[PDB]
Symmetry: C3
Subunit: 79 residues, 3 copies
Amino acid sequence: TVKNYETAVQFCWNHYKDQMDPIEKDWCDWAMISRPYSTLRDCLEHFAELFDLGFPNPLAERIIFETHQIHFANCSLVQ
Amino acid sequence: VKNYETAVQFCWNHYKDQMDPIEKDWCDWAMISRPYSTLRDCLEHFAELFDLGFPNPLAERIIFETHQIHFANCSL
Amino acid sequence: VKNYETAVQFCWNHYKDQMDPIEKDWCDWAMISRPYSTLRDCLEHFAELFDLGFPNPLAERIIFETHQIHFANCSLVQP
Ligand SMILES: [Ca+2]
Ligand SMILES: [Ca+2]
């Protein structure tokens, strides 16, 4: 039922992974992958405002660092 | 505070003074967000005051810094 | 620039063109803010041009790259 920020962040991440898991072959398609990533960021900020925490905030930024390490860090910058 | 670099140091020290006594709580994400927001507000207030963009490379180094010393070892 | 990825290379190449002649000043924070602000504005402009979110993963990889090659080892205050 989502009643604090930590569990909100889990909610956002879970929705994000549901998008990212089955499209591994396109993680470095920068234009395409910008959509689910936007939905992650925006979810993170939406729930930051809902719980009156600022944005960015440390948990949100750990989450953004985590996707960069697991999805994007070893992508080529030109396809 | 004669310039941006010394304003950034001023911001950074008001932040640490808030953070050092509450090491136990550095991974209480809700709580810790407050002093962190003050640091960002400070970094941005002084950026505009010295007519520099935000984010900017020095402000970003301060953000990496606090992630490295306060939040890196935290369970998510 | 036929797409976002090539837009991001134009931004990045223009940035390096301004940075390379001022290597002795990469740690002059107030000074080096100008070319960096232009880089961010360039990344955001083309982002909005191609109706992608900003920030986005590719743009963030460029940010990380300048932090790694330009600013990682600078003193936080000049002598
Ligand atoms: Ca805009
Ligand atoms: Ca779009």
